[PDB]
Design a protein around this ligand. Structure first.
Ligand SMILES: Nc1nc2c(ncn2[C@@H]2O[C@H](COP(=O)(O)OP(=O)(O)OP(=O)(O)O)[C@@H](O)[C@H]2O)c(=O)[nH]1
Ligand SMILES: [Mg+2]
Lengths: 62, 204, 78, 156, 156, 173
């Protein structure tokens, strides 16, 4: 037999929010995980700064 | 094949390509310009006719669904390149009877190519309406090659004729009146096949 | 004989599937495809980089319990 | 004065009435700065192409003059012209879907004639070859023109 | 009305908190000094193990007022050398195609991942530009060399 | 005879090469199977309407134990007969190997594919299944060393090809 063990589901509030915006049901699962903090709201990020943060590294290595 | 001007070198390259076509991934065949190069650069050259037609026969024997426009263009281009070297008004019987070995080998290879491609992709050729004339001309070539007095060539043509007759019969085994859609295509040329069978009947 | 496997979708989504070592993998495939109202043909599945055939079995690749499977969406250009 | 009237609804006979003036009247009237108008003029001229000896010669000389004036312009990218020509004939798709043409016999014959002229760049041959050997329903309708064009392309 | 802005803001929040490694999806600030959610500037890393590897390609993205009803227009800037990218840079993708595989569920992250997976999987059967398709069919290793050269040019 | 041609007779073991040559040489049919060791060279002479034609037939050994200088027997050969057995499918499955060995030494020579033992009712290699000669442009004949069916057709075809006279015929003298 082949069966399913578990399937993640976010909070019902996020379920309703995703329904409102027609987003995937599991869209908000990121913020429901551990090591989550308040939502910083500045978004003072330009493309140049985002490129700089990469520091020329964009590929993981084993 | 695209820069060399040395006849033996290019002939050797084609001879090896003929062997590579047995196993190479189909991506190297239908997703490049191999078919067009074979049809236009080497098929018309007298010293490259036979090997190029052998390569085209190997390509035509591939039965796959992912590539069907390449088979369609493998047929129209080949036929257009074939009526500029073997005119439809040629008496292949007499010409073959007194001809060089290269020409006889070409006639046998042409019978093999037509038989293989028709047996494989007759459905594809029939589906397209604007390709009706090309299909009729291919059948005319098959009828012309059926007159050659060579047992092997006649067997090659006869297997295709038997295939077509069996297919048409299995479509509808009743005499013509409506008519089945696929039988209407071959009506103008079925009496020619009947005449050929009556004229060259073998000893029982 | 019966082990759990981790499938990571392209939506930061993780799902645990219980499967045998001999049963065909395609059974799981369709499930993950119908999770988001998607047909089978849309999604693509990768395990250890290479592609996983529908009828393949974990026995050939020896997929241990809780192993990581990545799912990609194959794009069709125009 | 009637060049525009002919261009509105081109017809094989209307081209003849212009006489030898058609050689330069078409070239002069057409705005060759923008390749789109050059391609439109080329298609309109070649749409009335016919195997009749008198008509074909007029069409071919008009096309030669139009491209000679078009290709001798620094502010005129040849690749843009080729891409637009392929788009209009339906051999290629476009960001904004411009409706294709029905018959490619005339355009293909005009291209075959053009490929054999000097002003035609030797760099656009591979693109035309690739998109003419490219399978397409609109091409299999005119097999003879396609085959002649392919032979001409493989010559160069 | 506010559905578009709310969805864009929420997905930007999600991207800031959670996004794939190597991607950038920065919404360009409006000139007055406030966020302009309509226009986004994104960066896609060439998938590792492929000739596109070792490069980060920019991509502008424009949304409509009816989003997510209609898909966004994605344009590489400057245009890339890909069979399925138009000369103007617009990316031809079925997912981005309005009438083929468009669903409001798809988000910016999934669009970018699909574009990344498109780079190594060109659809040459229906090409979007002539130069890339011609080079791809004529000689494949030349196409790979060109891709590597541009990736080095576009390297961080 | 002054006009001499070298014929190479290849094929699996027990297919009937030695019996086929002996019937022409003396007209007697051999019923016992004695494997050929290496090669045996036999001169056959036919009388065509254009004069005598001589084949120096090199009848080789089809068993791997008795191969000898196998591909060294094909040097300077001018015609070939590849013989298989219609009562044995394995013999027909090995024709490609014999043809490969033959054409790796003799690039362009006339080749006849002979299917022997067609007088036996239990035929395993049916006529429809013999399609190897087509893409290789070889001749094909169903023969029988026991019944003399199509007995001289292989040699007649080879003589027509080598001499270059399509209107050549054998006349007994
Ligand atoms: N029924 C029947 N038997 C045949 C025929 N031709 C040959 N044989 C038998 O087949 C056996 C094998 O033939 P041979 O010529 O002796 O063997 P070979 O062809 O020389 O093979 P090798 O010597 O091993 O290389 C002979 O003993 C014959 O009796 C035939 O036409 N009909
Ligand atoms: Mg023997």
């Amino acid at each position: 037999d082949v069966l399913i063990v578990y399937e993640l589901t976010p909070t019902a509030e996020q379920k309703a929010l995703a329904t409102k915006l027609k987003l995937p049901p599991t869209f908000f699962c990121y913020k429901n995980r551990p090591d989550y903090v308040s939502e910083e709201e500045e978004d003072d990020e330009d493309f140049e700064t985002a490129v700089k943060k990469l520091n020329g590294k964009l590929y993981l290595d084993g | 094949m695209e820069n060399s001007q040395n006849a033996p070198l290019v002939h050797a390259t084609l001879e090896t390509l003929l062997r590579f076509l047995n196993w190479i991934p189909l991506g190297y065949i239908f997703e490049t310009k191999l078919i067009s190069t074979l049809i236009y650069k080497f098929l018309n050259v007298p010293m490259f006719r036979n090997v190029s037609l052998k390569c085209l026969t190997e390509i035509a024997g591939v039965s796959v669904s992912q590539y069907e426009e390449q088979f369609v263009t493998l047929f129209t281009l080949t036929m257009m390149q074939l009526k500029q070297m073997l005119p439809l008004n040629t008496n292949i019987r007499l010409a073959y009877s007194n001809g060089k070995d290269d020409e006889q080998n070409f006639i046998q290879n042409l019978s093999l190519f037509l038989c293989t491609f028709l047996k494989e992709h007759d459905q594809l050729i029939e589906k397209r309406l604007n390709l009706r004339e090309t299909l009729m001309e291919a059948l005319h070539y098959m009828l012309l090659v059926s007159e050659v007095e060579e047992t092997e060539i006649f067997k090659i043509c006869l297997e295709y004729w038997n295939h077509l007759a069996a297919e048409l019969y299995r479509e509808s085994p009743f005499s013509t009146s409506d008519v089945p859609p696929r039988r209407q295509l071959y009506l103008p040329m079925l009496f020619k096949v009947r005449l050929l069978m009556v004229s060259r009947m073998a000893k029982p | 004989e019966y082990i759990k496997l981790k499938v990571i979708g392209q939506d930061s989504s993780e799902i645990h599937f219980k499967v045998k070592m001999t049963t065909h993998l395609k059974k799981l495939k369709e499930s993950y495809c119908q999770r988001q109202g998607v047909p089978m043909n849309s999604l693509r599945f990768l395990f250890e980089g290479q592609r996983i055939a529908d009828n393949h079995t974990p026995k050939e690749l020896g997929m241990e319990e809780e192993d990581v499977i990545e799912v990609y969406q194959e794009p069709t250009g125009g | 004065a009637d060049v525009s009237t002919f261009l509105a609804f081109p017809s094989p006979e209307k081209l003849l009435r212009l006489g030898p003036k058609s050689s330069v009247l078409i070239a002069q009237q057409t705005d060759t700065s923008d390749p789109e108008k050059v391609v439109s003029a080329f298609l309109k001229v070649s749409s009335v192409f016919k195997d009749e000896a008198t008509v074909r010669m007029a069409v071919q000389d008009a096309v030669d003059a139009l491209m000679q004036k078009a290709f001798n312009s620094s502010s005129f990218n040849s690749n843009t012209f080729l891409t637009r020509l392929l788009v209009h004939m339906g051999l290629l798709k476009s960001e904004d879907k411009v409706k294709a043409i029905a018959n490619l016999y005339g355009p293909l014959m005009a291209l075959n004639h053009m490929v054999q002229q000097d002003y035609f760049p030797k760099a656009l041959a591979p693109l035309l070859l690739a998109f003419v050997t490219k399978p397409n329903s609109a091409l299999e309708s005119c097999s003879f023109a396609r085959h002649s064009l392919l032979q001409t392309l493989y010559k160069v | 009305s506010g559905i578009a802005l709310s969805r864009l803001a929420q997905e930007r929040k999600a991207w800031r908190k959670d996004h794939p490694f190597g991607f950038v999806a920065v919404p360009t600030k409006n000139p007055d000094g406030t966020m302009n959610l309509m226009n986004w500037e994104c960066a896609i890393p060439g998938k590792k193990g492929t000739p596109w590897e070792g490069g980060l390609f920019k991509l502008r993205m424009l949304f409509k007022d009816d989003y997510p009803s209609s898909p966004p227009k994605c344009k590489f800037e400057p245009p890339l050398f890909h069979p399925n990218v138009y000369p103007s840079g617009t990316v031809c993708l079925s997912i981005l195609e309005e009438d083929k595989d468009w669903r409001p569920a798809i988000t910016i992250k999934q669009i970018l991942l699909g574009i990344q997976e498109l780079l190594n999987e060109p659809n040459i059967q229906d090409p979007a530009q002539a130069e890339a398709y011609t080079i791809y069919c004529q000689n494949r290793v030349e196409y790979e060399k060109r891709v590597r050269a541009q990736a080095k040019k576009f390297a961080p | 005879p002054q006009v001499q041609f070298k014929l190479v007779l290849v094929g699996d073991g027990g297919t009937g090469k030695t019996t086929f040559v002996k019937r022409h040489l003396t007209g007697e049919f051999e019923k016992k199977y004695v494997a050929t060791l290496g090669v045996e060279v036999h001169p056959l002479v036919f009388h065509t309407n254009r004069g005598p034609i001589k084949f120096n037939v090199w009848d080789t050994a089809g068993l791997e134990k008795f191969g000898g200088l196998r591909d060294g027997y094909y040097i300077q050969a001018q015609c070939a007969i590849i013989m298989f057995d219609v009562t044995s499918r394995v013999t027909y499955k090995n024709v490609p190997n014999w043809h490969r060995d033959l054409v790796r030494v003799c690039e362009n020579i006339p080749i006849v594919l002979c299917g022997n033992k067609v007088d036996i009712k239990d035929r395993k290699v049916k006529a429809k299944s013999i399609v190897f000669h087509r893409k290789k442009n070889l001749q094909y004949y169903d023969i029988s060393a026991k019944s003399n069916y199509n007995f001289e057709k292989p040699f007649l075809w080879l003589a027509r090809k080598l001499i270059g006279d399509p209107n050549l015929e054998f006349v007994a003298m």
